[PDB]
Each structure stands twice: as structure tokens, then as C-alpha cells.
Amino acid sequence: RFSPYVFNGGTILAIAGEDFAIVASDTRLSEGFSIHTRDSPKCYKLTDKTVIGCSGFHGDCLTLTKIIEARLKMYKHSNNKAMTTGAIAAMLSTILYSRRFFPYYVYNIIGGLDEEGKGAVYSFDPVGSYQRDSFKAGGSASAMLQPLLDNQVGFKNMQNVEHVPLSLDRAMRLVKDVFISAAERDVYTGDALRICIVTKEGIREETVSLRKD
């Protein structure tokens, strides 16, 4: 019959830093056993201090992106100020519960800066719960990426290894290596990488290619 869902895939990564938020994602849009394109960035710049990525069903990703932009403009044009990160998190959670009985089949990650100027990653689920964490991997490559970030960021399951805070460039090298290592084994991953970095001075972007198969 008509099915309302299809799995487009995707891979979204986020890291909460000391004063930074790094969000990176591949740009492959595929379906079944074919490739639609090799250029579709899942990352989107909302404000100067907020970047969202959306994987899963692609049409709901586009629609949700547009509705979120609309409500951003509503809040600013009503209240003369931009949102914080957690306010956007609460708003997205209320929307995802507002379509409870016909869900968005979409994974969501909001990264950005708080009002203290520190990194804050809000993870999500297709029904609309959320929490402030340091790092998440969204998409089909979630399990391929989470234990390595437990190894490096959390320093978990290690002995006599002290806690050094994560710098910027080390995190960049981490993101490049984890997407290479996941692109070696995942099929929904490759050809590019759209890396977005949130500082206290704006948004930086950077495109790192991958293997072409």
C-alpha cells in the first residue's frame, strides 16, 4: 500500500565544548538501493548562536526546518530578542509532542551556546523528549560512533588517564577521524562532510570530502 514513511538515513554529530558547539554531518541523501544526491547538508544555521541538524524522513526535516524558522521570526518580531538554545529546545519538544499521534520520523540535534557562552547540546527523539548532553550521534551511524566518543570525550573504561578538557582543533581531528571510520563501514555515509562550528564570534563552516563510493 501507500506507506507514509521512508528511511533516508543520515548521520549527525554534535560536541559540546568549553565555549563552542561543533555540529557536523555528511551530505548524502539516499533511498533504498540508490543515491539521490551527494550534496544535501543536514546542518542549518538558525541564529548566530544556534545550529540544528535533522536526519530521518527528509520531507519532515524540511517542513520542520521551515516551521522552526517561522517561530524564530515570530518570537523575535514579538519580543525584540532572539531565542536562547534551551528555549528552542523546549519549542521543538512541544512541536514534536503536538504531532504525537502521527509522528515525525526524524532525529533531531540542537547545538549552540548558552547565555554563559558555553557549549550546550540538546538531543531529541521522534516523540519529543530532550536533555542537555555533551555529545550525541544521530542517524543510522549512531552505534558506530557512540562508544568511541565514550572513549575519548568521556575517557570512560580507562585507568590512570586524567581528564584534559577538549580543545577545538583536537575535536576537529576527532570529527574527521570518526566520519572516516564510520564511512568505511556504513552505507548511508560518505562523499563529503559539512562541519559547522559555533564560537562567541559567529559560525564557521568547512567542507571535508570523503571517498566517492
Partner 1 sequence: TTTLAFKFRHGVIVAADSRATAGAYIASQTVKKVIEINPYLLGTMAGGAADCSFWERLLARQCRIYELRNKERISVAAASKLLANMVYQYKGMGLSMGTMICGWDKRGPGLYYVDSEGNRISGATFSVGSGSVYAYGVMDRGYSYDLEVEQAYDLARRAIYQATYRDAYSGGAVNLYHVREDGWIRVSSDNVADLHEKYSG
Partner 2 sequence: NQYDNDVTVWSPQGRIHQIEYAMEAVKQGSATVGLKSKTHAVLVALKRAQSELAAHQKKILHVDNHIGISIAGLTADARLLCNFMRQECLDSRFVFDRPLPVSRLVSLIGSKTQIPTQRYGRRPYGVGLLIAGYDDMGPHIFQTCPSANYFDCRAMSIGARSQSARTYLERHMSEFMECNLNELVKHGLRALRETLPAEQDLTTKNVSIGIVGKDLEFTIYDDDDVSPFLEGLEERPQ
Partner 3 sequence: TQNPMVTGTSVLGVKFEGGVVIAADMLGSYGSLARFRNISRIMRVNNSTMLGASGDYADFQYLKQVLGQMVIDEELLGDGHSYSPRAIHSWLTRAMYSRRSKMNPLWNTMVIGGYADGESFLGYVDMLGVAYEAPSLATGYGAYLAQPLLREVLEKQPVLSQTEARDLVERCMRVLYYRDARSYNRFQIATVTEKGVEIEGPLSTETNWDIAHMI
Residues in the site for partner 3, rule: CB under 8 A?
Answer: 1-2, 4, 6, 8, 29, 31, 34, 36-37, 40, 57-60, 62-63, 102
Q: Which stretch binds partner 2 (CB under 8 A): 46-54, 65-73, 130-138, 179-187?
A: 65-73
DSSP 144: T
Count of CB atoms situated within 10 Å of the CB of 156 = 11
Tracing cell 544521530 back to the chain, one arrives at: 138
Return the residues of window 96-155 that contact partner 1 according to CB under 8 A.
96-97, 100-101, 123, 125, 127-129, 131, 133, 142-143
Cβ-contact 102, 143 below 8 angstroms = no
Beta-bridge partners for 55: 107
Cβ proximity to partner 2, 1 vs 66, nearer residue: 66
Q: How far is the CB of 7 from partner 1 (least distance, A)?
A: 15
Sign of the dihedral defined by the CA atoms of residues 93, 96, 101, 107, in that order: negative
**Binding string, 50-89, against partner 1, x = CB under 8 A?**
----------------------------------------
The CA distance from 146 to 137, in Å, is 6
Position 81 contacts partner 2 (CB under 8 A): no
